[PDB]
């Protein structure tokens, strides 16, 4: 299995640098197949869903970014507004090349 | 193979756009596979690839936003530069989602 060390501390981290402290009691992270994605949600009660297939090829890097995302969909919503955009360029300055490196390391 | 007729639409209407006409008799589109990459250039023959493989399931939108995308690197070269993010967003707004998009069709 992924080591939990790591996504624990990396959830707690982006939890606390988003202000989502309020929904630490409600937010977690589950680990199973995904049927077309690598993340999602369940907004109802705050699941954060990672695709157990594409875990083990994510850099350290790479699973911060996919959490971060996932967490401004649980504070923002269904888009990505610019107050979204402006947050994950923040926490993540090289975005846009983690993006590009991210569709060419994984298609199947 | 893939319909030419949408190809060599998106094709003229982008290099138009993006004021590349000047560069309109040397830029072709040739499909082929390609080993970890969607698309790629070779600058010195201004060829755009695009992985044989993938462009059966992409969408028309995320056939025009890989070539705009492509078209920027014979732009402005090999780095995101500020002019290149900026013509990209304004070519595509939505530009963001169409990169995770993109990302959780092509891992499954
Ligand atoms: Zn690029
Ligand atoms: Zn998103």
Chains 1, 2 share one sequence.
């Not at 077309?36 to 369940?42: D, G, L, V, Y």
């Not at 297939?53 to 996919?66: A, G, H, M, Q």
């Not at 994950?88 to 300055?93: N, V």
Request: hydrophobic letters at 40%; zero cysteines; proline letters at 3%.
């Amino acid at each position: 299995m992924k080591d939990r060390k790591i996504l624990n501390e990396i959830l707690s981290n982006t939890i606390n640098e988003l202000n989502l402290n309020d929904k630490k009691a409600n937010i977690k992270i589950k680990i199973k197949p995904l049927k077309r994605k690598i993340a999602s949600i369940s907004l109802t009660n705050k699941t954060i869903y990672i695709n157990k297939n594409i875990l083990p090829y994510l850099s350290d890097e790479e699973i911060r970014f996919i959490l971060a995302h996932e967490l401004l969909h649980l504070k923002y919503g269904k888009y990505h507004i610019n107050e979204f955009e402006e947050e994950l360029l923040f926490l993540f300055p090289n975005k846009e090349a983690i993006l590009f490196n991210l569709i060419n390391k994984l298609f199947q």
